[PDB]
Amino acid sequence: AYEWGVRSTRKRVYEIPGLEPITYEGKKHFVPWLARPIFPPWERGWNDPRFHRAAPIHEQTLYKEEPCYI
Amino acid sequence: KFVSWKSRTKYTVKPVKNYRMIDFLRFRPEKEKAPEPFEEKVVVVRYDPCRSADIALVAGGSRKRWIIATENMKAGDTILNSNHIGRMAVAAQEGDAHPLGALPVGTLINNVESEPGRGAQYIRAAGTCGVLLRKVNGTAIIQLPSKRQMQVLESCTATVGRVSNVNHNQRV
Amino acid sequence: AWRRDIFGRIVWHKFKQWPIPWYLNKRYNRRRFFAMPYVDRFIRLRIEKHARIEARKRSLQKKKEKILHAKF
Amino acid sequence: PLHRYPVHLWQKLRLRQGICARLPAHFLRSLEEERTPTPVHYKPHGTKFKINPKNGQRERVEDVPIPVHYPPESQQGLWGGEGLILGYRYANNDKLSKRVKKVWKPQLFTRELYSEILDKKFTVTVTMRTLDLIDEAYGFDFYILKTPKEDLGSKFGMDLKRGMLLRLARQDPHLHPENPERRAAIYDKYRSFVIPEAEAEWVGLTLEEALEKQRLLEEKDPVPLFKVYVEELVQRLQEQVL
Amino acid sequence: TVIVERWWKVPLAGEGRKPHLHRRHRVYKLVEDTKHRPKDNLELILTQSVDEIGVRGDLVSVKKSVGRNKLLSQGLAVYASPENRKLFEEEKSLR
Amino acid sequence: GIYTSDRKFVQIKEMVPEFVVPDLTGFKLKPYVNYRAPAGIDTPLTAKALFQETVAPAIEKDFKEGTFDANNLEKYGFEPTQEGKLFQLYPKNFPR
RNA sequence: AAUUAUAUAACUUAUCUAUUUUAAGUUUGAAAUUUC
RNA sequence: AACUAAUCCUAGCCCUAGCCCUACAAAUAUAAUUAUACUAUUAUAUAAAUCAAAACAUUUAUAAAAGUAUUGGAGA
């Protein structure tokens, strides 16, 4: 059968206002009994080519609407 | 941790280490064409290791794609894929994909889809043919190999002719 | 810092420097710093073992004491 | 050897020593105090006396509470004290009949209730008894605050209680934003439940959460010994100047 | 709601002790269960119009889930709390 | 060093240690000491001793003069952060 | 085999759902008891 | 009076009493003990049966009142 959608997938405390749920961020390691912390984006301090990702074509300054066939 | 073996990023007609990626949505508008009826050529009738029926390479425009072969498909045959619902009976060449509205009652069909756009899921086995039992306005009756007769919209795509190995059901 | 191993013991964990943070380090997260529920039985055994060690030690001293009385 | 204190007293020793002793007194009192849940499926015996079969004399009687199983899903919802009763049944209510393994399931539902204090509508698992209790409590917010933890029988309800108690305690402008006049009415309406901010924080907190909270409260960056000596030197010199 | 009672009496443990339950004490009798019964009556206010159970604005007593599954679920009925009840009568007074 | 792609070793000059060798010319300390020289009673240096020897005289004079304030704690030798020094006391980032 | 066989499963009525004018029966049998 | 062997006392233990407990560097859960990224990370339903009832089936313990009464294939 032709599959629409990848076949692989086929077979409270935070809500409180004014208070902050405790999370294992202070522990510095995961524990199942503590809530998952909210992590801001990480800054390496330098650019790693191995982990670098090329920017999308449209964002490129040289991007042109007309298509050039090479 | 389970990843399916059918994980090739790009659809290709070349054998893949071999397995050939089949296409069961017969009317997929090809490149450099509008969503209107288009024609294709049966390049070669090859053998599919992963399916009982033999697959026929159908090529049109700038796109080449494998499809299931019907009873009489051979190399060099012409296959038409139409979305338009013909006012009159549309010329029927075995293996062509046409709306059930175009076809007349009694024509053997295969690779039918229960719902429009679902894609071919039944009558894909060797020797399986669906009979168009009845036709009324935008509704048609398609007999699937399970013996289940179902009523579907005329927009559903059906491929004329029986599947290859016509004597599969007669095997002794 | 002081951390609990999977055996329920409390041990000083020496921190390691990494180029990535802990939450982005799956392997560091994969490392287990949590004790399983079954360790409660082991904890009782550890307390009993400590008491057993003291009891055995007294027996060892008693045998030494025997000769002290015999010698003196 | 033999343990001087029984196993049940071991927990008491930990509570009385270490970080547990350093825990806030109000939270410790809340943990220490135990309140029996209101009976729901069992009623006390009508008579206080009966004829003792063995001696043929009138004897005092005792009440056996019916066992009721409360699934954790109840702790994530607002059940009015109802719970799953697991046991055996005799067909037609005669012991002479066959015994059939039966699990009795109270009819459970998920419905939405509006909270004035939080100014939000929450969709939660609820039973018919809770809805009547909410009406008897004169509002959903009142029901959460008025009902005790045991009668409430919901960790989320306790979580709501912690937020509601803290919200009332702080007079936080977060209640009904851009409507200060409406905010005052809600605080006045629920003025009875106003309590100190410190107490409200620890309401409904789990033991593991409480221990981490106290650890987070008591953890403090090491004092540079340079600073400590500087203050000590200045203090001693200042005393000498006097 | 389900109500059960032990078939076998548990021997008295005295003033300040806990009786030890046994296998025959584990068999219980079902005095009453709402599941076996038809749904018990529930008091609700119709917030819309439903076929042949009255009209919006009336107070009707209906079987607990029959009203809940049909009326309240579709939104036809609502629960009568004192806060909205006093609003309803005040609204009805202005009506 | 670091192994880059293609299984090729790429030595990193920074990660390669450089041996800092002291100049021993004119240095009178030798592997052994005289038996004539009396043995030294161990008096390990401590934070209190270091603070008393160097920091205490400065604060004592300044405190009597009254020119003492929090902003000038660094003047007496406090380091707000260990960054900027090649050798950082904590976390230790330098080898022996 | 005889005798039962509210394990379940079905149907009927409840049940729970929609609308709208598991329990009790029965049946199968998970089995039970005794005989051959 | 000879060979093979034998000779010995502490190595230590056992039970109560008493007593709860709060006893280097470097590497490590990745492949444990691999100095830095991979791959997210996770235990447990009545305890049962055996056994006793000489088999087996409900059933089978785990201060005085008193082994009285009841219960129980009224039997262990």
Residue B148 tokens, joined: 């289940």
Q: Which nucleotides of H are covered by protein (CB under 7 A)?
A: 9-15, 17-23, 26-30, 35-44, 46, 59-60, 62, 68-70
**Integer Cα distance of D144 and D77 in angstroms:** 12
How far out from the chain centre does Cα F14 lie? Answer: 21
Per DSSP (E only), the strands in D32-172 are 49-52, 57-60, 85-90, 99-104, 109-115, 120-126
What resolution (Å)?
4.6
- Integer CA distances (angstroms), D10 to C32, D14, D16, D213, D215, in order: 27, 7, 10, 22, 21
Q: What distance in Å separates the CA atoms of residue D220 and residue B111, rounded to the nearest whole number?
A: 71
Q: How many other CB atoms are found less than 10 A from the CB of residue B109?
A: 25
CA–centroid distance for C5 within its chain: 10
**With a 7 Å cutoff on the CB, does E34 touch strand G?**
yes
Q: How far is CA D35 from CA A16, C8, D116, D149, D153, in A?
A: 25, 33, 28, 8, 12
Nucleotide nearest to D90 (CA to C1'): G6
d(CA E6, CA E3): 11
Residue type, D119: D
Closest CB from A25, A30, A33 relative to C29: A30
Instruction: Quote the CA–CA distance of F44 and B33 in Å, as a whole number.
Output: 89
Whole-number Å distance between alpha carbons of D127 and E2: 13
Q: Are B50 and B19 in contact (CB under 8 A)?
A: yes
Answer for the pair D195, A50: CB distance below 8 angstroms, yes or no: no
Record the tokens describing residue B106, joined without a space.
Answer: 């009694």
Query: Is residue E65's beta carbon less than 7 angstroms from any atom in nucleic acid strand G?
Result: yes
Shortest CA gap A39–chain D (Å): 18
Residue A68 Cα distances to A59, A64, B30, angstroms: 17, 9, 21
The structure was resolved experimentally with: cryo-EM
Q: What type of residue is F27? A: F
Rounded distance between C-alpha atoms, residue E95 and residue E85, angstroms: 15
Chains that touch E (3 or more CB pairs under 8 A): D
Residue in chain B nearest A11 by alpha carbon:
B2
Nearest CA in chain A to D208: A33
CB E84 within 8 A of CB E45: no
> E strands along E1-95, which residues?
2-6, 28-33, 41-46, 59-63, 77-78
Sign of the dihedral through C-alpha D65, D69, D70, D72: positive
Q: Do D229 and F55 touch (CB under 8 A)?
A: yes
- Enumerate the nucleotides of strand G whose atoms come under 7 Å of any protein CB: 6-8, 14-25
Which parts of chain B are beta strand (E)? 38-45, 55-60, 63-68, 78-81, 97-99, 108-110, 130-136, 139-143, 149-153, 157-160
The dihedral of CA F4, F8, F11, F15: what is its sign?
positive
E94 close contact with D: CB closer than 8 A: no
* C-alpha distance from C28 to closest chain A C-alpha (Å): 8
Closest among F53, A31, D83, D111 to E72, alpha carbons compared = D111
